[PDB]
Amino acid sequence: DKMKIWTSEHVFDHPWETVTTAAMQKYPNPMNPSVVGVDVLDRHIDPSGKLHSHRLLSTEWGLPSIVKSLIGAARTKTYVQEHSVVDPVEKTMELKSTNISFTNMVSVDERLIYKPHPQDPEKTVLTQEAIITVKGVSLSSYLEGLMASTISSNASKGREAMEWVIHKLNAEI
Amino acid sequence: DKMKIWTSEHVFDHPWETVTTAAMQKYPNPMNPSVVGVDVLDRHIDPSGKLHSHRLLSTEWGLPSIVKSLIGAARTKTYVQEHSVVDPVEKTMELKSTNISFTNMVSVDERLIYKPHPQDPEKTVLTQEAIITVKGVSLSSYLEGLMASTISSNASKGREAMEWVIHKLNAEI
Amino acid sequence: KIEEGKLVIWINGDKGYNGLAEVGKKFEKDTGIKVTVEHPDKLEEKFPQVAATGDGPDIIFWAHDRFGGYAQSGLLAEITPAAAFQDKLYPFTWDAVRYNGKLIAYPIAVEALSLIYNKDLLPNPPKTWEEIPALDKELKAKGKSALMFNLQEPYFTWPLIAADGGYAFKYAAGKYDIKDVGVDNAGAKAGLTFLVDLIKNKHMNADTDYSIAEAAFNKGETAMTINGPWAWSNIDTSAVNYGVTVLPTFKGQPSKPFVGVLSAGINAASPNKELAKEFLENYLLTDEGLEAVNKDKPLGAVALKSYEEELAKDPRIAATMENAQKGEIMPNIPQMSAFWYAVRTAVINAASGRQTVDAALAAAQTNAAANSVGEACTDMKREYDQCFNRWFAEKFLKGDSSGDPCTDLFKRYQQCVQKAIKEKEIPIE
Amino acid sequence: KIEEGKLVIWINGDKGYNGLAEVGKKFEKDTGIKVTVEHPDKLEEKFPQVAATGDGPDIIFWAHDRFGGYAQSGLLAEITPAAAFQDKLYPFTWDAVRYNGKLIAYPIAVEALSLIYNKDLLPNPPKTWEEIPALDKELKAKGKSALMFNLQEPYFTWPLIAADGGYAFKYAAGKYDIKDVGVDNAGAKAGLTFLVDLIKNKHMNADTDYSIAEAAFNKGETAMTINGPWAWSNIDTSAVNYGVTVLPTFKGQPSKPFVGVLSAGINAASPNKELAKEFLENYLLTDEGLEAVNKDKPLGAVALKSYEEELAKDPRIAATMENAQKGEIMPNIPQMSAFWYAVRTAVINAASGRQTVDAALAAAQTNAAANSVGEACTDMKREYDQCFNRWFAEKFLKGDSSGDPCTDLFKRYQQCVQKAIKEKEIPIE
Ligand SMILES: OC[C@H]1O[C@H](O[C@H]2[C@H](O)[C@@H](O)[C@@H](O)O[C@@H]2CO)[C@H](O)[C@@H](O)[C@@H]1O
Ligand SMILES: OC[C@H]1O[C@H](O[C@H]2[C@H](O)[C@@H](O)[C@@H](O)O[C@@H]2CO)[C@H](O)[C@@H](O)[C@@H]1O
Ligand code: NA
């Protein structure tokens, strides 16, 4: 049940304190103008001292040609739910986020962790994953599975064709 | 370099002579009304006595709503090239077919063989393969590879966002 | 392989080829460029065969319905008449001969079938399809046949089919759906049923062709027949005074006959493309030239405005236009050649009672899709395939092949398709 | 938590709340149902806070621009006036208060800013923004200030920005593109630059608020000011004879001021939804009721046809409509609350010279997207976030938290968003 369609490690030239502070107030910004509404639904410091943040993000896809016509028919905004945990002693910031908008159909899930750089506390390390789950089945499995579906289906039509042709053919003489 | 997105074996209750004869005159038929033109480009009996047929099939996709408008703009017909070989002594009929229409972009390839039924010469056996090659790379590889592409790409925007936010954040005090 | 400095012109042998020949003579007397007019048997098939090789006539005359096929299989040149010339002819006729907004031939005249009757035997012609059997009995009694017409070409029977319902391709939003074929619909069946009943009830006979029926009616042995503007001239010289009128109604709905504009195309493999344009525009499509042809055999309703005026005082063109309006214009889609054989074979089967209507007609429905890729080659394709399926089964699989099969039917067919591919621009290995 | 059988009505303290109170008295005398009119400080923010809990007034009065926010965050009831009633009011005003083709409030009057000047000090008012500094020098010389107006609310400065170029959201094909914000465009910068220059050149002062400027001008210490129909009444009782006229032009282009229709919405959490409709339709929106309000403080140009007629003989409504036509109507999109803070903070910064125009304005561009999901909560969201980012950094990360942060700003904010989610129908875990 595992298939991490991606995974990545990167480094910021900034101390975790400031990377984390900045991550809390990330939106809105010029590099992500599609993020139009961010709200903190709940926030708790837990028994162990870990700050928990649950945030909701609203995103408007950039298809500005028929948008006026389109939004009357249906909403143009996608929503992703987010869960972050800050440990201020061990200096880690986790962040697990799913889209809520089309999760019945598909479910992209991204996990991120910010800890200081083992070699230089001034730098910050960001490791990153992502799982696409098309139907709880990997993207690859699902996409191939479709090919089974229709390939064999069309195959099954061709065999009717043959029988019909043969029937006409057998009928000739 | 191998990934047979599908594979199948089926049986006709008809003797290979007649299945093969009927396969030669398969089109046009009611079960495949999307096949509108079939032409034999070349046919040779080879030094070993094997009949070779190269056929071209024209198919019109069934999207009859904007077809009048659509065809003026561009052709609505897809083309598949076909190669068949008949051995009349060993009683086998091979058939390798590719689409020619969008092969630069993608290339579905189907292989079929009709021999008599080992247990009953009156019945005919049809085994069947199919290879999808999206870019000469399997469908699965290609489709996952895209996820790399954009996932990491969006990841790379988020890191700009962070820097910009941080720069503004660092600038405050 | 067409010679330069002559013109060669094909037109069907039922058309007025001598008249057209005279028009060429005037052309030769004025230019000195020789014109040769031919009327080759089965020309609808013969053109394609020769055109594919790069041979054939410089100018080809046929009903417009097959010109879309011809053009798209790379055989016709795009015609380029001036804007002033186009005003000279009805724009309705320019459309019949227009494919992908390119003009592919010159329209000459509008033709449709009418009821020709013997005014001495039928004082008043039946307005009703269904009244005929009753009439035949009376007429047989006086030693004659009520009606006789060409049962071999589906053109002549089509009106009676498309009467209660029945179509080649449904016309939807300015385009024809090639996937929608009204050969196997409810009324198309009733139409064709009526026809066969008539043969079974001894009233008609399945064998009757064009000549058989022309002869009998012009001999005065039959009271009515169904034919076109061209046939009038042989009736005239015979001592039968005749009328042309509307076709009988089936189920009290008009008989619908497909309408064709006799058009004139210029061969893609022709060095003489500008002589052919002058001959067509400046000699044939004039009051003078069109009269010459029309005198020999009538053209129906000419597409030249200036001569259609001088002509539509004819009470027979009147009746042609009536019937023309009562039916549909023919499609010039490439799938037409396919359609025609499908029904052609359907009709005889019913008529000779070998297949029944439902079978033969259901058959047609699907056989109508038996197009080639180069639809000008659809007829050659049939003959080569019909040859191979006989061979493959009888000879090759039985292990009696002596070499590659139906090599001569294949030879030409290959060339048509090859030319057509280039025109259609498909890429192969 | 709203009581049944009373009505409570909020309207801003610069509006004519006593007049409105009188209208309630007539209502009480006729029905016996008590009416209570309040004017709570910072009402644009106060309504949302209380509305979210299920508390607040039954009826809320504000410029229409913030009503789209209010409605979509589940706070307003859909209004259901009869077709006959709608004919009574201008359809232009019904549109300002219509969101997703649902009416969300009753429009009351159309308001826009004009130039009010002292006819004793300025015989002829400057038609030109750029002529002011020159005038100030002369006026300072006689011991007075040329112009003074509210530099704290961005409403008052907006006209001068949207003059050479500058917009909230581009309007494209009947919808507003929320991704296109004209706060950071070329002329928006020049506009705002002009303003700040004026403070630097000692002509204005950044500190000036509403009251400061009202006082000075009504005291006769200044020649001009920029204000709305409401402010006229305090000028009247003061011994200054005044004119209202067009705003000076910037770059020879009109000063564009956003126009608002003072509308009146019914709280979603209100048992008295049918008393509120009768009070609004049958008491306030009548010649009688509207006069009462207008007498206390003028309403600008009423949306009631039958009273707008009786009124537009006023040469000041005339000048309001002139200026109203010269600018744009305000959007009622939810993103408006966001937009307003973005510019509000932009302007002061420039004015107090702390940030320069390009910086403060670039800042606004992006801050304008700082919407909440429940955009009625966008203001509460700001205050909670501004609190958390101070805490998180100063307290929590330094390991000095004593418990969950900014709990009281968070409390209400949470409720607004929660109500808004239901209204927007999002699904969460
Ligand atoms: O057959 C004589 C008569 O019919 C023709 O109509 C044709 C049609 O145009 C062809 O494409 C053919 O396959 O089908 C019909 C005959 O079944 C001509 O239009 C007409 O001039 C000709 O005399
Ligand atoms: O501020 C006084 C004056 O301005 C108002 O305009 C508002 C706008 O309607 C609000 O949404 C706010 O954030 O921005 C503007 C002020 O900066 C009212 O329209 C008007 O009645 C009120 O008197
Ligand atoms: Na999930």
Ligand code: NA
């Ligand atoms: Na291939």
